Design a protein around this ligand. Structure first.
Ligand SMILES: CC(=O)N[C@@H]1[C@@H](O)[C@H](O[C@@H]2O[C@H](CO)[C@@H](O[C@@H]3O[C@H](CO)[C@@H](O[C@@H]4O[C@H](CO)[C@@H](O)[C@H](O)[C@H]4NC(C)=O)[C@H](O)[C@H]3NC(C)=O)[C@H](O)[C@H]2NC(C)=O)[C@@H](CO)O[C@H]1O
Length: 364
């Protein structure tokens, strides 16, 4: 059966409506797997820094009581944690063992079903440390299993969808044996970090008709194909789908993909971060905007004034699910359900319109 793996985040709790998210906003039957982002590491041991830590625990038990099949994982890593967050824990056998033992105890004590390691990114420098850490975790989880009456703790990893970073960071065949699945981060293909700075879509399914050479790697279709080619079984690929888009401020009258941009788009009023918008912000931006669907890339962008936003909607997600089924992938992953219109109060499409569309397509 296809998985629907849903990340939610610690920091959405600080937002104003309609972006104010706490774990009680989670629908227990919406996803097959939930992933909390992110735990940290202190004195080589896993810890959660979250004033709402006790709420998270209560909610975990409540959700799992309501849906005995639900799996809830703890993620550590992410972009801001970077590689530095894993040091000094990773630099010795004794310090990794301390971490791993703390993980098993913590996960069991708080009713989690497994660990997601989203190291952003190992790159060439930390390839070895990451490979070793994953291997030692898998082994320890297996050893824990043989001595327990409970199910084996799951181990997953959020991984790059960029060909160069994939080649640099990962020993893929080994990863295929140690991981239950990958959460393929198939988004951020384009954004305001690029040079030269031109518009491009966050998460195009396929390449543009004019894309040749390396430009042709920056899409979901290519990333999924590449991971499988490198030795990840298709059923262990859980394909990431974003509920946010990337915005640009246009530098000229041109409004097409590849148009000149002067910088990131204006910050949204709720997420307050120049360069992206959550879906509950996008649906407001679309009012008064001009929407274009790329027939080649299979996704929409919209323009209003000097703002250009590449994003995903119900339609582009239905196409992405047809793709994942056709490639026999393990399911879909969402970054992140707290940026869908979870309350339904913004987009006039009911609660969780994007994730519900995915769930529906997966089961139809
Ligand atoms: C083709 C290619 O290789 N492109 C590179 C880009 O991928 C890269 O941008 C970074 O991409 C990573 C995924 O590879 C992304 O991190 C994951 O994705 C989400 C959404 O972007 C991140 O969410 C952010 O988390 C931080 C805390 O860590 C929050 O502060 C922030 O608000 C979140 N943003 C959003 C929109 O929700 C996650 O951290 C992470 N997910 C997991 C499971 O780990 C980075 O965010 C991307 N970096 C930036 C600056 O956007 C790009 C820059 O490195 O380089 C290209 O080459």
């Amino acid at each position: 059966a296809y998985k629907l793996v849903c990340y939610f985040t610690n920091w959405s709790q600080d937002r104003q409506e309609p972006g104010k998210f706490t774990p009680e906003n989670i629908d227990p039957f919406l996803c097959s797997h939930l992933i909390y982002s992110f735990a940290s590491i202190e004195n080589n041991k896993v810890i959660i820094k979250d004033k709402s830590e006790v709420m998270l625990y209560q909610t975990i038990n409540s959700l799992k009581t309501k849906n005995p099949k639900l799996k809830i994982l703890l993620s550590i890593g992410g972009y801001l944690f970077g590689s530095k967050g894993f040091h000094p824990m990773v630099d010795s056998s004794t310090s990794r063992l301390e971490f791993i033992n703390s993980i098993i105890l913590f996960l069991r004590n708080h009713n989690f079903d497994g660990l997601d390691v989203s190291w952003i990114y190992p790159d060439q420098k930390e390839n070895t440390h990451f490979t070793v850490l994953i291997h030692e975790l898998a082994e320890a989880f297996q050893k824990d299993f043989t001595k327990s009456t409970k199910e084996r703790l799951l181990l997953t990893a959020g991984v790059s969808a960029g060909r160069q970073m994939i080649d640099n960071s990962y020993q893929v065949e080994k990863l295929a044996k140690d991981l239950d699945f990958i959460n393929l981060l198939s988004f951020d293909f384009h954004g305001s970090w690029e040079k030269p700075l031109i518009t491009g879509h966050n998460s195009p399914l396929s390449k543009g008709w004019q894309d040749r050479g390396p430009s042709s790697y920056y899409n979901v279709e290519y990333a999924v194909g590449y991971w499988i080619h490198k030795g990840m079984p298709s059923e262990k690929v859980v394909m990431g789908i974003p509920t946010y888009g990337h915005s640009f401020t246009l530098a000229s009258a041109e409004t097409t993909v590849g148009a000149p941009a002067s910088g990131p788009g204006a910050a949204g009023p709720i997420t307050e971060s120049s360069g992206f918008l959550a879906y509950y912000e996008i649906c407001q931006f679309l009012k008064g905007a001009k929407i274009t669907r790329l027939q080649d890339q299979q996704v929409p962008y919209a323009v209003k004034g000097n703002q250009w936003v590449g994003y995903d909607d119900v339609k582009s997600m239905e196409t992405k699910v047809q793709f994942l089924k056709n490639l026999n992938l393990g399911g879909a992953m969402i970054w992140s359900i707290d940026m869908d219109d979870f309350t339904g109060k913004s987009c006039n499409q009911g609660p969780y319109p994007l994730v519900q569309a995915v769930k529906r397509s997966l089961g139809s």
